């Protein structure tokens, strides 16, 4: 497996507002370490909304067709767009969970930064975001170009399949 | 090869204001981080801040609101501004490089300046 | 921040014997840790950086491993101008973090 990059040099959108980036954001295409295009191939869409609470932390709730509903909280960390995953002491298989907005504009799209240990395996991947459920070739492009800059290959991105059931929320 | 220097005033009253230049040779400053990391008599390492290639910087939350990072890109200078000093932050002021290549790790240091904050 | 629990404290070692100092970070850091040495008087140089690697100019009775939150740094034949200060850095984000350092002493 493909060694995970640091946060300093994973990119970080530079003042980042958390107002701006709240709300629903539709997974355009993942890419990342554990991933395999030859033989997975493709995956169904599904979105994630973030809702900023008082905190500043947010509900993460991941809308998926199969509904099921993935909830978690992100905790704004050191830098302003990275974040831990709250009360991480309850998921058993994670033992580290980064989270970086690499780069948005609030408005069309968002390149985030997953990175975790699980069962002491390092995986890292960067979704594309999309406020709607479909994207300029530039930027499906650019995320290519992103990912390949990570260290990644063409096997380890994946584009999704468009839904209409569940993710409209 | 590449080097750095700490220099600027090396006595400062407690009233006053520190700054200190470093000047960088052997490379560009729009290419690499410098970052300032202080050590008091007999004590640890600390990291001040920073300012990147891109210009942007940061700063330990201990001394955001104190401190000021700037730079001449032309003129191979980077320059550090505290206030509000007290007899404590006395000590050498490491002026310091980090480059994306080898992933933003320390690997160049200036000699260090002695700063002994006193009346 | 990320902690950085570095021991022990300080070090006494005869000539030819093997050391090893031991640093624990606060989350886990994938690796990104870096080994320095600082004789009194002069500034840190870096040993080793990404855990394991060594730099140009590192002899090679100096090595680091580990993994996760849990990393170490051995001399295997401390020699006489091993005598320093070591401190164990994370730069996997800022703040940068140092552990509070091993001032390693020689017997005799």
């Known amino acids: 497996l493909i060694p995970a990059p640091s946060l300093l040099t994973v990119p970080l959108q530079p003042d980042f507002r958390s107002d701006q980036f709240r709300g629903r954001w539709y997974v355009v295409g993942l890419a990342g370490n554990a991933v395999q295009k030859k033989t997975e191939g493709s995956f169904t869409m599904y979105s994630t909304i973030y809702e900023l609470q008082e905190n500043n932390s947010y509900n993460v709730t991941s809308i998926l067709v199969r509904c099921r509903y993935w909830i978690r909280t992100f905790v704004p960390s050191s830098r302003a767009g990275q974040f831990t995953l709250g009360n991480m002491h309850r998921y058993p298989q994670v033992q580290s969970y980064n989270v970086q907005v690499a780069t948005t504009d609030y408005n069309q799209f968002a390149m985030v930064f997953f990175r975790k240990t699980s069962e002491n395996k390092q995986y890292f991947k960067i979704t594309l975001y999309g406020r709607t459920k479909e994207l300029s070739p530039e930027l499906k492009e650019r995320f290519t170009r992103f990912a390949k800059s990570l260290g990644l290959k063409d096997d380890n991105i994946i584009f999704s399949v468009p839904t209409d059931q569940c993710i409209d929320n | 090869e590449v080097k750095l220097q700490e220099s600027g005033p090396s006595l400062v009253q407690p009233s006053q204001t520190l700054s200190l230049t470093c000047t960088v040779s052997?490379?560009?400053?729009?290419?690499?981080?410098v970052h300032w990391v202080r050590q008091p008599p007999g004590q640890g390492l600390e990291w001040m801040g920073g300012?990147?290639?891109?210009?942007?910087?940061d700063y330990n939350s201990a001394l955001k609101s104190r401190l000021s990072i700037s730079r001449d890109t032309s003129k191979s200078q980077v320059f550090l501004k505290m206030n509000s000093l007290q007899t404590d932050d006395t000590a050498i002021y490491f002026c310091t490089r980090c480059r994306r290549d080898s992933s933003y790790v320390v690997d160049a240091w200036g000699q260090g300046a002695s700063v002994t904050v006193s009346s | 921040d990320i902690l950085m629990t570095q021991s022990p404290l300080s070090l006494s070692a005869s000539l030819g014997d093997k050391v090893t100092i031991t640093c624990q970070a606060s989350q886990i850091i994938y690796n990104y840790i870096a080994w320095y040495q600082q004789k009194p008087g002069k500034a840190p140089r870096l040993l080793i950086r990404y855990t394991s690697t060594l730099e140009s100019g590192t002899p090679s009775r100096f090595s680091g491993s580990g993994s996760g939150r849990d990393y170490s740094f051995s001399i295997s034949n401390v020699e006489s101008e091993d005598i320093a200060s070591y401190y164990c850095l994370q730069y996997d984000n800022l703040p940068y973090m140092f552990g509070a350092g091993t001032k390693l002493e020689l017997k005799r």
């Open positions: 052997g490379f560009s400053l729009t290419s690499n981080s």
């Open positions: 300012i990147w290639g891109d210009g942007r910087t």
